């Protein structure tokens, strides 16, 4: 299932304990793309289906390849869309622990959104995973205004976008194993560090 709108569709009277907001890569389908579904099923296994809400960044985020060249690595409209989702999560489910992630253009989108977010909401994101982070070199492997201990970057050797380029090479399409294992492992660990059991 490449489309998940658990936060938008979810009942505020029965909020999940964990809300995961994910931005897909360039030209990918639905709002989860290629890696999102793998991360989602593993999160569901850990917290249960009613324990976690999976929400992809859709709407105005069209994941247009050309937008990788814009100043922030994505469009202003897309940043507005993701910011809106974090805000919706914060108002709809005040007590939920948030987690985020993004691949390729979506990783730049996640970094830009998190950087602009009001600190009170940003501080609720227990962990963020970034694959093929297009702003990896420029941001020195960090997300501005966000702690390094809550951030995990997956940048393959040979994935040119991780070294300051916008060229798409084979390693950029090889994050499958990370999405199936270490990425969700990191997210679950970070949620448990603050929520306990």
Q: CA torsion sign, 13 to 83 to 43 to 67?
A: positive
| CATH code, 148 | 3.40.50.1820
Q: Which residues of 99-132 are buried (b: 16+ CB within 10 A; e: fewer)?
A: bbbbbbbbbbbbbbbbebbeeebbebbbbbbbbb
Could you tell me if 58 and 22 are in contact, meaning their C-beta atoms sit under 8 angstroms apart?
no
Show Cβ contacts of residue 115 under 8 Å, excluding neighbours closer than 6 positions.
143, 144, 145, 146
Q: What is the resolution in angstroms?
A: 1.7
Q: Is 83 exposed, middle or buried (0-12, 13-18, 19+ CB in 10 A)?
A: middle
* Solving technique: X-ray
Strands 97-103 and 52-56, by their bridges, are: unpaired
How far, in Å, CA of 171 to CA of 132, rounded? 9
Annotated catalytic sites, by residue? 104, 159, 172
Cα Rg of the chain, angstroms: 15
The angle, 0 to 180 degrees and rounded to 10, between the axes of the packed helices 105-116 and 76-92 is 60
Residue 42 belongs to domain spanning: 1-197
Residue 168 in tokens: 């798409």
Long-range contacts made by residues 110-114, C-beta under 8 angstroms, separation at least 24?
110/23, 110/82, 110/143, 111/73, 111/135, 111/139, 111/143, 111/144, 112/72, 112/73, 112/74, 112/79, 113/79, 113/82, 113/83, 113/86, 114/143, 114/144, 114/145, 114/146
Integer CA distances (angstroms), 91 to 1, 15, 120, 128, 162, in order = 26, 11, 12, 20, 34
| Count of structural domains, the chain | 1
């Amino acid at each position: 299932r490449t489309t998940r709108d658990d936060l938008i569709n979810g009942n505020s009277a029965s909020c999940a304990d964990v809300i995961f907001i994910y931005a897909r890569g360039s030209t990918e389908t639905g709002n989860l793309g290629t890696l999102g579904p793998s991360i989602a099923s593993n999160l569901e296994s850990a917290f249960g289906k009613d324990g976690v809400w999976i929400q992809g960044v859709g709407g105005a985020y069209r994941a247009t390849l050309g937008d990788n060249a814009l100043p922030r690595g994505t469009s202003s409209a897309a940043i507005r869309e993701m910011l809106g989702l974090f805000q919706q999560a914060n108002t709809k489910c005040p007590d939920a622990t948030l987690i985020a992630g993004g691949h390729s253009q979506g990783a730049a989108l996640a970094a830009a959104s998190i950087e602009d977010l009001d600190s009170a909401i940003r501080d609720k994101i227990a962990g963020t995973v970034l694959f093929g982070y297009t702003k990896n070199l420029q941001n020195r492997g960090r997300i501005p205004n966000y702690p390094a201990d809550r951030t995990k970057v997956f940048c393959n050797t040979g994935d040119l976008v991780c070294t300051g380029s916008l060229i798409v090479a084979a390693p950029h399409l090889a994050y499958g194993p990370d999405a199936r294992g270490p990425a969700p492992e990191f997210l679950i660990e970070k949620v448990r560090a603050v929520r306990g059991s």
